Structure formats: structure tokens, C-alpha cells
Amino acid sequence: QFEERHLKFLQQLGKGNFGSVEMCRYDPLQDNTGEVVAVKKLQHSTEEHLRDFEREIEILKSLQHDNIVKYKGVCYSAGRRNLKLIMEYLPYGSLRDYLQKHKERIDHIKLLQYTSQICKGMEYLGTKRYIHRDLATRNILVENENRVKIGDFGLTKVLPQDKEYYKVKEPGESPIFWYAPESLTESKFSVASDVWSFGVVLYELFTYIEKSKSPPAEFMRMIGNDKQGQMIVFHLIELLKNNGRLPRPDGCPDEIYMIMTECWNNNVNQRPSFRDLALRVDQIRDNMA
Numbered sequence: 001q002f003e004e005r006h007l008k009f010l011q012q013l014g015k016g017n018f019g020s021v022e023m024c025r026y027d028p029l030q031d032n033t034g035e036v037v038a039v040k041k042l043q044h045s046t047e048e049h050l051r052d053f054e055r056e057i058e059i060l061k062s063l064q065h066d067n068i069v070k071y072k073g074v075c076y077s078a079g080r081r082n083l084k085l086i087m088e089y090l091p092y093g094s095l096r097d098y099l100q101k102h103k104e105r106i107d108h109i110k111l112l113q114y115t116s117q118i119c120k121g122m123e124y125l126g127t128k129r130y131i132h133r134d135l136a137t138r139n140i141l142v143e144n145e146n147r148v149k150i151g152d153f154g155l156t157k158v159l160p161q162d163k164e165y166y167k168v169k170e171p172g173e174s175p176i177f178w179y180a181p182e183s184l185t186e187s188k189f190s191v192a193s194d195v196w197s198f199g200v201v202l203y204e205l206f207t208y209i210e211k212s213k214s215p216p217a218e219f220m221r222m223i224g225n226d227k228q229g230q231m232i233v234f235h236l237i238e239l240l241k242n243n244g245r246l247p248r249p250d251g252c253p254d255e256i257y258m259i260m261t262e263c264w265n266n267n268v269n270q271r272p273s274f275r276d277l278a279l280r281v282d283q284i285r286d287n288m289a
């Protein structure tokens with residue numbers, strides 16, 4: 001759909017797990033009438049990454065929801081190598097940076113608005129049996145002050161038809177401080193591990209991304225900063241099996257922290273569903289208004 005000769009580079013937006021994203025202008029008339037778009041590409045176009053990137057593209061194309069970043073197309077040159085994914089451009093960047101920069105205008109009601117939008121997006125993913133696997137505020141984007149969207153599907157897996165978990169071990173470093181215990185121990189990913197990660201996202205939101213209060217800082221302080229290398233993971237595992245948890249963020253109401261701790265159940269089957277999470281969050285939001 002998009003021809004790369006018209007994809008005009010404006011800046012690099014971010015560099016992630018085997019991918020990078022650039023802000024470009026698609027200007028096929030070359031008269032500065034084209035629209036600004038986001039362009040995702042691989043930084044090493046090997047074949048596992050190309051096939052996984054094709055899976056990611058197909059997954060994003062199959063999703064249409066107010067709280068999921070919009071797929072716009074693909075662009076290739078030289079016979080389908082250098083595949084690029086074209087997406088809508090969201091002008092406010094990640095929810096992590098946005099929250100860090102506007103923490104004194106964003107009150108609790110607004111945090112719960114974002115929360116409820118994230119839960120609706122995640123429930124829509126669950127209806128397609130997609131497991132996102134990388135839920136974090138750095139991965140949620142801000143369209144405007146009233147709308148956020150889940151935004152990076154590079155790790156998203158489709159559940160097998162006969163099971164409710166997906167076992168995956170990738171080469172790479174892993175956002176272990178967002179991982180459910182069964183994901184750390186058995187590499188099992190499910191809707192319930194996405195619910196654990198969502199609990200961590202709720203924590204993040206209510207810390208307003210204060211630097212010492214991030215999940216990596218809190219967990220490294222809890223287990224001890226002398227842990228170093230693979231051994232860190234080991235200690236984290238013990239911390240979670242002895243019911244060590246991230247603390248209640250400053251100013252967080254007890255109801256919200258209880259939602260968080262209910263999402264951090266060691267028992268996979270006792271974690272709430274995203275529909276219930278949305279219902280509780282919406283009722284709290286209505287109580288506050």
C-alpha cells in the first residue's frame with residue numbers, strides 16, 4: 001500500500017525489542033500534504049524476526065478498537081525484504097512519558113479513565129485469544145488527554161486452540177519485573193499473566209512514574225541491590241512465592257491497591273478477569289465523580 005520512496009523520515013521515536021519506530025511523513029504528492037505516520041522496522045532482518053514481524057503485522061491488522069493503535073499498512077522494497085509496518089502516529093508519546101510530564105494535572109479520576117481504557121483494550125484482545133505479554137506504561141500510547149491505546153504487539157502470541165496458556169522462551173532480556181511468577185518459572189503466558197502485568201501497570205500509573213518508585217527499583221531494593229546477573233531472577237522468584245509485593249504508592253486509595261494485589265495472586269485461576277477489572281474501576285470512577 002505504501003511505497004517507500006514517499007516515506008519521508010522525520011525522526012526516530014524509539015528503539016525496542018528487535019524493532020525501531022520512526023516518525024515519518026507519507027507524502028506521495030511531494031507537496032507537504034501527506035500525513036504523519038509511525039513506521040516500525042526491524043533492526044536486523046533475520047528470518048525468525050521477519051516471520052515474527054509478519055505475525056505481529058497480521059495480529060495488528062486483525063484488531064480494530066478505540067484503545068488499540070491503528071494499523072495503516074505495510075511497505076516493502078526489493079521484493080518484500082525490509083518490510084515496514086505503517087501505523088497511525090499518536091502525538092503525545094508513551095503513557096509513561098506523558099504521565100511523567102503532566103503529573104500535576106492528572107488526578108486519580110483521570111488515571112482510572114486510562115485504566116478502564118486499558119482494560120477494555122485487553123478484554124478485546126482476550127476475545128481473540130491474543131496474549132499481549134508486554135503490558136507496561138512505556139508500551140501504552142497517548143492519543144490525546146482523554147484517550148490512550150495499547151501500542152506494541154511484537155511479543156503478542158495467539159493461544160493454542162486446546163490450551164489457555166502459551167509457553168514461550170525467547171532469546172533476549174525480559175521485563176521480569178512485570179512478569180507473573182508462572183511466566184518467570186515455567187515460561188507460561190496467559191490472559192491471567194496479562195492480568196498480573198496489568199496490576200503492575202496500575203501500580204505504575206499511581207506512582208506517577210517517580211524514579212525510585214518504579215517496579216525495577218522497588219523489587220531490586222526489596223531483594224537487595226547486591227543481586228547481580230541471572231541470580232537476580234532467582235531471588236525475585238522467592239520474593240513472589242513468599243508474597244512479597246510492590247508497596248502501595250503514595251496517595252493511592254486502599255480500593256485501588258486492593259485491585260492491584262488481587263491481580264498479583266500467585267494462584268493463576270484466582271486472578272480477576274479484565275471485564276471484572278473494568279467493572280470495578282468504572283464503579284470506583286463513578287463514586288469519585
Ligand SMILES: Cc1cnc(Nc2cc(F)c(C3CCN(C)CC3)c(F)c2)nc1Nc1ccc(F)c(N2CCCS2(=O)=O)c1
Nearest residue numbers: 013014015016017019021038087088089090091092093152
Ligand atoms: C505506533 C506509534 C504511534 N505514535 C507514536 N508517537 C510517539 C510520539 C512521541 F513524541 C514519542 C517520543 C516521546 C519521548 N521522546 C523521547 C521523543 C518522542 C514517541 F516515542 C512516540 N508512537 C508509536 N509507537 C512507538 C513509539 C516509540 C517506541 F519506542 C515504540 N516501541 C517499538 C520499540 C519499543 S516500543 O515497543 O515502545 C513504539
